[PDB]
Structure formats: C-alpha cells, structure tokens
Symmetry: D2
Subunit: 416 residues, 4 copies
Amino acid sequence: PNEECLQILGNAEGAKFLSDAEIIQLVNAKHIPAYKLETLIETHERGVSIRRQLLSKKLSEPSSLQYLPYRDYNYSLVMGACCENVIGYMPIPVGVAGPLCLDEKEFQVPMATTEGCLVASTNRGCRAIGLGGGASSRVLADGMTRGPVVRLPRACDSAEVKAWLETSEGFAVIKEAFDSTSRFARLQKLHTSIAGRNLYIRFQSRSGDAMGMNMISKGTEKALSKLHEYFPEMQILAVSGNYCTDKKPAAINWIEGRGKSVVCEAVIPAKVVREVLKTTTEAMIEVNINKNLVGSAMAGSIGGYNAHAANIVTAIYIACGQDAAQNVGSSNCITLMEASGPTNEDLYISCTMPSIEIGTVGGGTNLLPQQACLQMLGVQGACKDNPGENARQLARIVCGTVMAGELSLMAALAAG
Amino acid sequence: GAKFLSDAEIIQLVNAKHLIETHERGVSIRRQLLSKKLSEPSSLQYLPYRDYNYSLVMGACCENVIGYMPIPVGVAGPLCLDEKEFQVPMATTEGCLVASTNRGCRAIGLGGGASSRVLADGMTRGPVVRLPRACDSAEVKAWLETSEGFAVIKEAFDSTSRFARLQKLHTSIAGRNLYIRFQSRSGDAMGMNMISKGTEKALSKLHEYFPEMQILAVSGNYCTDKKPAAINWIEGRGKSVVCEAVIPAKVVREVLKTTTEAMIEVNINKNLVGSAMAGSIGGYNAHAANIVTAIYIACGQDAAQNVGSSNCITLMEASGPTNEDLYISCTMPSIEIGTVGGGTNLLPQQACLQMLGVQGACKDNPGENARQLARIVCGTVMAGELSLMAALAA
Amino acid sequence: AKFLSDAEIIQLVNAIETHERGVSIRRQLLSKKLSEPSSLQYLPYRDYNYSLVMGACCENVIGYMPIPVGVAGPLCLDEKEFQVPMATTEGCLVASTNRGCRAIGLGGGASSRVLADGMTRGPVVRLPRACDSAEVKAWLETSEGFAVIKEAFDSTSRFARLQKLHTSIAGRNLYIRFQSRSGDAMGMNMISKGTEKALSKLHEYFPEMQILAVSGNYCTDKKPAAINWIEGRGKSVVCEAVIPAKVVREVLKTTTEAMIEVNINKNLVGSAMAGSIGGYNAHAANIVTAIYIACGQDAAQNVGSSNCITLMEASGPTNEDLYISCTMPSIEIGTVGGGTNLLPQQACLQMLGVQGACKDNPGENARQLARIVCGTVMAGELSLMAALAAGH
Amino acid sequence: AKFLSDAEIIQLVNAKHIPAYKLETLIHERGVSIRRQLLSKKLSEPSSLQYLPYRDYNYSLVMGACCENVIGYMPIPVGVAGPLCLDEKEFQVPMATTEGCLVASTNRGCRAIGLGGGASSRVLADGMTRGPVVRLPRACDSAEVKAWLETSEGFAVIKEAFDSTSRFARLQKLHTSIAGRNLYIRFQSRSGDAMGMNMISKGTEKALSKLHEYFPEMQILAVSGNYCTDKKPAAINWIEGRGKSVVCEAVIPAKVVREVLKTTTEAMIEVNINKNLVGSAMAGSIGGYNAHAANIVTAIYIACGQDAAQNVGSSNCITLMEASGPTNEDLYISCTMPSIEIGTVGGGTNLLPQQACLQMLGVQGACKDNPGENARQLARIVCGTVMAGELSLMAALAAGH
Ligand SMILES: CC(C)n1c(CC[C@@H](O)C[C@@H](O)CC(=O)O)c(-c2ccc(F)cc2)c(-c2ccc(F)cc2)c1C(=O)Nc1ccccc1
Ligand SMILES: CC(C)n1c(CC[C@@H](O)C[C@@H](O)CC(=O)O)c(-c2ccc(F)cc2)c(-c2ccc(F)cc2)c1C(=O)Nc1ccccc1
Ligand SMILES: CC(C)n1c(CC[C@@H](O)C[C@@H](O)CC(=O)O)c(-c2ccc(F)cc2)c(-c2ccc(F)cc2)c1C(=O)Nc1ccccc1
Ligand SMILES: CC(C)n1c(CC[C@@H](O)C[C@@H](O)CC(=O)O)c(-c2ccc(F)cc2)c(-c2ccc(F)cc2)c1C(=O)Nc1ccccc1
C-alpha cells in the first residue's frame, strides 16, 4: 500500500521483500530519494531494471529502451568504477584484421566499429604488409603527462619558480616528492611555460602498463605540495590547466609527445602493390604527398598528416577497453610514402604517431570482454617481468594497424 | 547445405583450402578458427557473441565479425534545453563521467535552462584535382567562382539525390593542385556517402569543361574528415552550434561548490590561456570529447569523428544585476552527426536515439532530428564543462 | 624662433621655422637624457625631405635609418623583365636570390596569377545572449541583410566594394570579417571607415549590440592566423616555373631528384613536425621583408604576407626537369599610401613599373607588385634549396 | 680605373670589350654609381632611380657582408618612444617605421607605464637554434640514432664536437623528432651577444660530422630541415622558445587608465579577453594572442640592425589583462614573448647608423664582463615596448571613434 512498504524497507531484513511496483510507488511519492536506490536495492541488475522503469515513464515514447540490452551483464566490475546511472550496455560489433606481421610476430587485431568496409580494408592492408616481408616498429618515447596551472602574485615570481624548477637541486626535490607516490613513478625533465603570473608545469612519467592519469595526478598533487613549501604564496588554480594536453588538439603533444611515441615502417614489393593493392608505387606516392602532406597543410592541420588513423585508433580502443575520447590526440599521425629499391618501384611506407595514450591495466580494461580482446593480442594486464611492456606492445600494434589501414585506403583512393 | 555438416567438418574444409545458413553459426566458426591461431586459445571466453542481431551488421557495419563489445550506458538528465527536457545516454568506461555531467545538468535546470541554436549545416568532402600547370588550376578556380560555372556544377551535384543541395564552393590552390570543398545538407544522414556521390558527378561535369584535369583523390584531406584541421574550425563542418545558460550565484555555491568569480578565473586561464600555450586549434575546452564520444557510441555515430566533432570553445562571464551569476556558453562549429545510416540502423543504438526523440528521418522537416541531436550534444557538453570546471576550481 | 638660438630654445623648454631644425632640436634635447650623449653622432638626419613624413608616417622623428638596397634581376615573370629591389642587411641574400632569377630565366621564365584580392578587417561585437548573436549572423547571411550592409560600407569610398561576409560566433561574441578591394592602396584605413559605417547601420537593426572593438583579431592583421591561410587576405597569388635539368646542374649545382627530396622533407615534412600553419617554405620572409622595406610597404605585415607553400616535382619527358611553384594566399600590399608616399621608396616602385595608382585599371599596380613578390620569393626558394641540397 | 670617366667604362661594356658584371672588381661609391647607370637604361623609365639616395654612405662595411649588387640605400624614418620605465631604468626606444601614429601611440603607452610605477621583465630562457634533417636507411636506424643522442655519453660526444667551434658554443639539451627514416635534430645554444645563426650553423655542421662517424649510413639532407624554425610560423618556437624568452608586466592605477588611456580597467579586460584570446582563437592563431606586437618588434629591429625577416617568430606574444588592487579597479597587464630572436653584434649591428640606435639604449656591441647581457637587455626592451604598444592600442580600441 505505502506505509507497510516503508516499515519493510526500514526493517533490517529489506527492499528485496518489496516488488518493483511498490519500490517505484515509494519513489514517486517522495519517501525514497532517487539517489539512495543504489545502496538500498541488493542486486546490481535489479537496480538497473528499476532505473530504466522510472526513466521510461518520463520519455515521450515509453517503449524506447526495449532493444537496449541490460540483462545478464557483469555490473560488478562497472558499478563504482566505470559508469554511473547505468541503464544497460551498448553492443559494438567486433571484427578481426590479421594476421598483422609486426616485428617478426603475428597479431590478430580486434576492431570495434559500425563503419562498413573498415575491417575488410584494414585486413587487405595487413595482407600487403605480410606478403611484403612484415613491418617493424619502435617505441621512441614513453610517459603520460599532467599539466596543472599555478598562479603567483607577480610574473617576476612565476619566473623565479620556473628558474627554481630548472636547477639541478630544485628538480631533485620535486622528483623525490613525485616518485614517492608509486613504484612506477619516475619523473622526467619538467617542461614549463609562463603566461604572466600563470605558470604551466608539465609532469611526465612512465606508469607501468596503466594509461596513468590517476597515478600521474597523485604524484603531481604531492609534487605541488612540496613546491608550495618553498613558495607559499603560489596558488594552485587547477590540477589540469590544459597544458597536458588531454583530449583536446594541441601542438604540445605532437612536438613533445604524450604517452607512447611510436614509428612503424614496411617495404611493399611492386608486385604486391600491383596484385593486392591494385595500383602502382608511383601513384601511391603522388596521392600521399598531395593528400596527406599538401592537403592537410592547406586545411591548416596540426598533427593530421594521415588519411584515417582515427578510424583504426578508435576501433582498437573501443575493443580493448581504452578511453575512446583520447582518440583526439592518440590519432596524431604523419604517413610518409616514398620509392624504394633498384628501379624505384617498391613502396616504402612509414607511420609516425607521437602521442598514443594507451594502457592494458585500469579503466575499461578491467571489464572481461575488453580483456578478451587484450588477450588476443597477448597484452592483457600487467607485465610482471618487464613493467610497461604490454602497453608498449599495444602501442606498437596500434601504429602497425594504422599503417595497414593507411596502405589500403590510399590504394583505394589511388585507383578510384 | 552446410546445416547437414558439423562444426569440425566445415573447419576441416577451411584448413584444406576449400555457405553457412545462419549468421550466428558463421560467427561461431570464425571464432573457433581464430582461437587455434592464438597463444592463449581461451582468450575469447568472455567476448560475447550469442543471440546478437547479426542480420543488420553483416554486409553493412562490420566484417570478419567474432562477437560484440558491451559498453556500459548511463543517463545524464534531465537536461533542460530550449524549453524541453532530454535524458541523455552516454556509453563510457570512465568512472565519474556520467555523475559529473549529471551534476552539470542539475545546475542548468535550476538556473532556468539552457538555450541553443544551429548556426550552420552542411557535411563536406574535399577532393584534390590537378591540371598540367598552376595557371591552369587558376583558370579552373576562376571558372568555378563565376555564377554560370557554379550553376552547372550545382546542377550536376544536385541531380544525384533529393537532399543534394550544393552550397557555396570553397577552393584552394597549391601549385597545380586544386582542392575543392563541396558542401551540402543531407537530410538526417551524416551524409558522407551522399556527398561523395554528388562530388563524383560534379567533377565528371568539370572534366567536360577541363579535359586535362586529373582527379587525384576523391578526398584530398581538405574536407577535413577525422583529422584535426583549422578549416573545420573556421568554415564549420556538419552542424555548427552554440549553447548557453545563466546559473544563479546561489546554485553555483550549492550544486557546484565554488563561486562565479572562481569559475571565470579557471575558465580563462585553463580553457583560453592554457590551451593557447599548448598550441591548440579548436581545443579551448575542458573535456568536450568525453561527452561527444560517450553520446556518439551510445547513439550509433562514427566515434572516430570525435576528432573534429569535439572542437569547442568554452566561455564563462559575470552576469545579472550584481555580476554574481555565471554566464556560460559552448560553441561547437563542426559536430558531425546523423540519425539515419551507419551504426544508427542497429536496434540498441536506435533505443538511445528514441530516448532523445531523434531516431530515424523526420518526414515533416528533413534534417530536424540530426539538428536536434547536435543541440543535445552541445548542451550536454556545456553541462559537462560546468561540473568539471567547478570540480577543478575547488 | 627664427631670431632665437638653438641654445635659447632648449633652455625655454627645459625650464620652429623648418622641419630639419625641429629634428635637430629634438635630437639635442634627447641627447641630454642619454648615458652616452654622443649616441646620435652617426645617425643621419640632414637633407631628408621630412615634409611628407610629419603628421603621416612617423612622430618624434630624430632622423632616418639607411637600409642597403641591392638588386636581383632580371626576373623573367609573365614575359616581362623585372629588376627587383631588396632592402636588407643579410649577406648573400641578394646574391642568392639573383642566382634563382638566373635559373628561372634560362628555363623560359616564370608565370603567375592573382587568385583572390581583398583586404579585410574583423571587428568583434557582442549581443546580450548567444541567441541574439545567432539572430544577427542569420540576418547578415540573408541576401537582403547583406545588401543593406553592403550599401552602407560602399557609400564611404569610391573603391569600397563589399565582398561576401564571413562571420564566427563564440557565445555572445560575433566576429564579422569585412572584405573589399581598395584601388592601389593596401586599404586598412579605407576598410576601417567602411566597417564602422556598416556597423553603425547594423546597430539600427540590432540596438542592443555593443561594438567591442573595430578589430577583434578576426582580420587577422599582423598576427599568425589560419583564417588568412585558408580564406586569404589582400592578394592570393601562385607562381610557377620549370628549370631544365642542365640548368639545375650548372647554375644550381644539384639535380632535380635531390631538390624534390629536400623540398618534401624540409618544406612539407619538417614544417609539419614543427607544427607550422602556413610556413611550408624555406625563407619567403627574407624576400618579402626586403622588397617591403624597399618599396614603402608596412614591414610588420611580413607576419602573414610571408605565408607560403613551396612545391617541387619532376617534369618533362625524362622526368629530369624541375617543376617549382610557390603559393602565397595573403600578400598584404599597396602602391599608394603610407610609406609609398615617400620619394625614395617610390624610386623602387618606379623600377618595377608599379608606382602610384593605375588610372586605366585601378588596383592593377598593387596586383602587379604582388606577382613580383611571389615571383621573387620563388627565385629565393630555388636558390636556397639548391644550396641546401648540394650542402656547402 | 680612376683615370677613366663614367661614360668611357660604360662604352666598353656596351661594345662588349669588357665583361659586364665583372667590372666592380677592377673598380665603392663609384662602383654603385656605375651599377645604377648601367641599370637605368634597362628600365622602362631611365630616371626612376633619381630620388633613391646613394652618395655619402659607408659601403665598405656593407659590401660582401650585408648586401650585394648595391644601388643605394632606403631611409626609414626613426621616431622615439620614451621614457620607458623598465627594471628601475629609463629607455628611449628608437622605432624605424612609416606607419602613421605608431610612435605616438607607443609613446602614450610608455607614459601610462611610467605613471604606474614602471614595468618589470625577466628573461626566462636563452638560446638560438638550428634544426637539420638527416636520413637513415630505415626508421629503425633513425630510432637508433635518437636513442643514442639521448644517452648522456652520446650527448657528451656531440656536445664536445659542438662546443669546439666557438667559445660561446655551449650545447643545451637536444630535442629530436622522427618522421619515418627522417630524424630532425634541434640544436640549441647561447651565442654571446650575437643573434647566433652562423655560429650555431658551424657547431651544428661539426656535430653532425661527429655523428656521421658513429653512424656512417646517415645522409645529411639539409643543414636546416625547418625544425629550427627560422623565419616561418611554427608551434615549436611558441612551446620550446627560440632566442630569448621574455615576460614583462606592470600595474596601471585606475586613475591613470582614465586620464592617460581614456578608458577603464573593466573595459580593457573585456576587450583583451575577447580580441586577444577569443578573437585570435576563432581565427586559428598559434602564437598571435596580441594586438600589434609585430609593429613594435619590426620598428625596433629595423632601427637596431636586426634581421627584420625574423619578426615572423620574434613577434609571438600573449597579452594578458586582469583586475588588480583592493577594489579590482587597477589594470594588471603582461606580455609573454617566448621567441625574441635578437643580437647586438654581427650582421646589421655592424653598420654605424644602426649602432647609434643600439648605443641609444646602452646595448651596442659585446658586453665584455657579462657575455650576452647586451642582447638580453635588448630583448627585455623589446618586450617592454611591446607592452606599452598593447596598452595604448587596446585603450584606443576600447574607447572607440
Ligand atoms: C572503408 C574505408 C576505409 N573507406 C573509406 C572511408 C574512410 C572514411 O571513413 C575516412 C575518410 O573520409 C578519410 C579521408 O580520406 O579523408 C573510403 C572512402 C574514403 C573517402 C571517400 F571520399 C570515399 C570513400 C574507402 C574507399 C576509397 C576509395 C574507393 F574508390 C573506394 C572506397 C574505403 C575503403 O578502404 N574501401 C575498401 C573496401 C574494401 C577493401 C578495400 C578498401
Ligand atoms: C569524471 C571526470 C569528468 N573528472 C575528471 C577527469 C576528466 C578527464 O577525463 C578529462 C581531463 O583530463 C581534461 C582536463 O581537465 O585536462 C576529473 C579530473 C580531471 C583532471 C585531473 F587532473 C584529475 C581529475 C575530475 C575532477 C576534477 C577535480 C576534482 F577535484 C575532482 C575530480 C572529474 C569530475 O568531474 N569529478 C566529479 C565526480 C563526481 C561529481 C562531480 C565531479
Ligand atoms: C643567403 C641566404 C639565402 N642563405 C642562407 C641563410 C638563409 C636564412 O636567412 C634563412 C634560413 O635560416 C631558413 C631555413 O632554411 O631554415 C643560407 C644558410 C641557410 C641555413 C643554414 F643553416 C646555413 C646557411 C644559405 C646557404 C645554405 C647552404 C649552403 F651550403 C650555403 C649557404 C644561403 C645562400 O643561399 N647562400 C648562397 C649565396 C650565393 C649563391 C647561392 C647561395
Ligand atoms: C597607430 C596604431 C597603433 N593604431 C592603429 C593601427 C594598428 C594596426 O597597424 C594594427 C592593427 O590592425 C592590429 C589589430 O588590432 O588587429 C589603430 C587602428 C587599429 C585598428 C583599426 F581597425 C583602426 C585603427 C589605432 C586606433 C584604434 C582605435 C581608435 F579609436 C583610433 C586609433 C591606432 C592608435 O594607436 N592610435 C593612436 C594614435 C595616437 C595616440 C594614441 C593612439
């Protein structure tokens, strides 16, 4: 009825003795507040069921959520960690491009997308590479960043703090405070910029196999606590002052790197360019120069000297539990093509991606389906013997798959 | 046919270099084939695949399919936008993102609501052609800028589809390269394939006037699609949108745990000065990409287009009788979006579109559903900016 | 003053007849305040025509700075020959540019085209709300709205002919980019006059509009900006030439294949790694700056006027000939007004056959000068790139 | 050749008895006169050089050093803006320009700064750069070279080869970027008081010679691969700095903003945010978050014998304005300029008229007891004068009319 239901709710034995309708009655009349539903209802799926039911009555079409699935999904690894106000899950089709012949190994790359032909095209690119003797890649740099903004009374004071951070002694003190927060914390050279009394400080460090935002933030907050002891008039405006730079386009990531900086390359014989890619080396180069270099230049691109790196980065990231919003900066790529061999008929190809933001532990990689795709690549979880090696390998795979994707689309655009 | 054989027998046929009548059994066999090639043969255990509607995916949205990836969906709302309320779905695995955005919606609702406008509408495709000499490409640019030249090109472009309605051309020369940016609305479709078809016919017509022209590529990165580029920021691409709200001083204190004065200081020195020092083009915001990407995954959009669709400048100012109220606006000139085609043909993705009342084509007013979804995106972005900026202020 | 002494006038102030004595007195007054009173010893000031400078080109004038002018030519451009003046203090610059001119000449000369023409100004206005700024953008975009604004703008001057508007919104800010030719003048003052009269007219339709500044940096004038690269500003120009393989080896001391390699990997890839917007060239700014100083241009406008993409590819039957092109979207320039009122810089404009207004075809002298700047830049690219390729 | 006449030498070249442009070796003031006379008859108007000055100017320091094929010189009017009250000092700033009202406006900016207790500046960083592109057979090999250059022992070997070419050559930390088999190497060092291009180029070439021993396969494609970056707009100069990075600031009392600048603190903050931050942002600027730094930079440079072409990057500036004081009524202003490329020795600073302008500011030539102090000081004057210019123009725009 209503009164009886509240007696049963407050009875230490609880909400599981009420029906869905009785609980909703109690919400509509203002006896139980919308937010408290999380702790009161026992099972996670039943919490989702009720939130959906409440939501449906507020929609102009109450049957809207019919085909949004929710049942029998492991919400235990999601509640309090990955999502709030959960009403179900969104299934994204997963496909496989491979084998990807990279650094003398073969990889079957999972790709989550709803764009027709993207996987097939990426697959034909892998085929060209494989018959061409495989690709090779190198991690050139490694370190996630966080770029807080502090304010001092005057610009002369901000300059003083900058000079202090650049002394051997001052940096060593900040480094100890940063490095004390974690096993993996290992602060690299600080990069700083002034704008008046503003001072942007870019902390960079490895972070084992995790993407590292949480870890770099704990090291950063304690590093600024130490800096405040030497400069007590300094104010910390924001733990992020956009100098990182995270999830926005920025030259600083392209130039300094962020996360993993990777280069990949292959040489495709003329015969493979002809039979797999249906074009010539000469035609490919002409398209690459005038589209990926000259065209991006006329559009005023910073870091966007590629055909569709973002397609590959986004499909792999969604499949592999990465933060897909980091496609903004992680897609940064320059794709170069030149003639190779004795008569300039073989295609040399390289992709350079200075800011791959990636990890195999933490965040979405804690969910089991996301982990199935990480296991396909042999990169799931933390590498105990060699910390960071799995995330490094996953970066290489992304760069190699991007190259495969650049090969195929460019050959398609070359013919017509 | 294949139904009279077992799994092991069909697999024997594939291994000897030599069809299946259900989509799901096709998926199963591909998974078994793939699993023998992996170092951990059990790695696919927790990748689900059963009972998914593969009939709308095969031959349309994905190839070599081995299952699906579940992304948790949460709701941020109610979002009070243009005298209406929306419950915004957000597919994400980042803890706190949905809660933070939800808090931004709460501040906006208590402050009277947000208001938005679509400022421009047209998807683009930017091919690169070339002529024997730069003088020749200059002749072609000139011809295209005459009203008679543009009219014959518009006639060719427009004949390919109902919604193909060529707007003003934008051209750029680099030596004998000519980059031509074609632009048009596309109903409620995002419109890539449609504009591509109009482009092919228009260039074919241009060749009749200029036979020495070579079409080097149907995209010469002048569009620009899925790469950062100032041209999308300055000219727009897809929907250009602005949203705004005024948040009373009291609400900023109670819901957001800061003050108007503090919000302004952080916005200016983070989203304007900070982004400036970082050398940003179009990234003058805190985390528009989090909300764009989450809404996109949930609503069947092309998540790769978060690259350009995330472009956003966030501005905060003093407001009201005593300058204690918080004016906020987000401006997003290049939201690339649609409610038909691509991932929006799938049923779960269509559930999230039905939530917002923007699913499929609007018959009475073509494009209105895609326009409305772009406004919701800009409003949900503004909500997400409100809260995170407030969190960073404290 | 005529009956007084240099010293008595100086004591009057502490406690004029001609311009040169006004300069002499200012120099002496200033020399008192310097730690080294004889600093101005070798700063020349005598026998300079100060009448055209006062109240027009410079204030508090203590003299003038001599910048060596050298000549690079002949430059065979559009079947004409040009002796290009270059005011510089950088050694080897004129000499290198000259070698590039010689290379082009032996390849049959350069061809250029003006692709677009219109100086801009980009005010920022504010409305009470973003919805009001959007209403104004929409109004400006209708044919009737644009026509009202065009009539206003065009009424201020005989050369004021308003082209298509370009606008951008940022909340309640609206940025409006006005564009028009301006005869042979660079045209900032003219464009500004037309802009303010047009904004006044816009205010009659939208009284709540606040005009924040007549430049809101949307122009964009004398700062690096992608809008100039993509939409253009002033004159947009392309120049090209084909250098025979024999000329590349003999005059330039390199090969076609080596030139293409250096250009791709320095001017495209290198500039791309450096995060350049509009700087896809070797040293356009050197040539631009030198011509500008010599021809009475606003040298500060070298910021955007130097915007350039230099391309090189194989040409001819053998694929051994060198094709070169420079594309310069935003050359800001004029042959009337400002520093081109002065007689010495007019001498340099007279060398080029472009001094003053073109009466038969207004704007044609400024266009011609922009073609010369782009051609001379291409010559400078040719030579510096050759020298980088051959490597000492 | 002095025993012949003008008309005779010209008759010899026209008749082709003597090679034309190989005559000024046999013949400086008269060498110019003959080049002009020969040149005038090739022109559509043979009297066009009439009013181009050439007599009574020292061409000896100019010939084979600053200019070639010289036909005269171009006078640029020089105004003075001052006193500029900067770091407890007072400067009279030479500004060579032909733009009306520029000197006057900058002057009003100086006047407001002086009446607000003056400005303060700091050099934040210092070092000229050169950014060659080298090529290895493969990206993997280019990666090898980048890892080697990053080891402390690889760096010291390169640092010793770099520092050997000059006493001022002190190589700072190397910055590298890979693009396939391309490696771009940004060499940076102080250069005393010189702007330092030729000096850094010397040390770079020797340094690459050393690197060529450890990796014989390396091709030096070009001594500049645009990674410096010199005389083109580039985010790398904005983010890393180049030449001198400098910051300047002052507080203008409210009353001074009203009486001298004819506006208010509130109006100035508003215009600055929406023009120099938001406006530049909408226009797609990297490094151009200012009103007209280029005007001031260009004018000082021309007057002081700097390379005016380097105004492209030297003008990079962000101008910030903010409420100051107890009632938020005073104006805080600051200009940050990360890439002022400048020098007081070498190039155009060797010419005497240019040296007079340098002497005016007390920075001509080398500072013997503190090397580089004169160029640093000039950099600070540039940034201070830029801030004066921003003050005045922004107030003019804020008021209107
Ligand atoms: C499937 C993808 C990878 N793809 C695209 C879309 C890429 C899109 O998401 C980003 C681009 O917009 C980025 C850019 O280039 O600016 C096109 C495509 C591209 C551009 C265009 F204008 C029209 C179509 C093509 C394609 C290009 C030429 C053909 F003649 C045909 C198709 C393919 C593609 O790779 N198809 C493909 C199928 C089976 C096997 C091999 C190959
Ligand atoms: C959940 C998200 C939206 N969030 C983040 C991550 C945003 C991330 O995806 C983009 C950023 O990297 C973009 C940028 O700013 O550069 C932070 C966060 C940000 C930066 C940082 F260094 C440390 C943490 C915060 C946060 C900020 C201040 C606090 F004091 C605490 C948390 C929140 C956040 O919104 N938390 C939140 C929870 C419940 C309710 C309300 C509010
Ligand atoms: C005279 C000028 C045009 N020049 C320069 C300086 C250009 C300078 O102001 C802009 C550059 O910095 C822009 C850039 O490329 O980044 C160099 C020069 C360039 C770079 C460098 F590291 C060392 C020297 C060269 C040069 C280059 C290679 C040689 F092996 C020798 C000289 C010349 C030049 O063109 N000299 C020259 C003389 C007679 C005839 C032909 C040719
Ligand atoms: C003398 C210069 C420094 N100045 C300019 C031109 C600057 C020009 O080279 C760069 C700009 O284009 C950069 C930019 O803002 O984008 C304007 C000017 C600017 C823009 C415009 F649209 C109309 C005029 C002004 C000015 C501005 C408002 C007034 F109401 C009047 C004039 C002055 C100026 O400083 N005048 C001035 C005179 C005596 C004393 C004090 C002050």
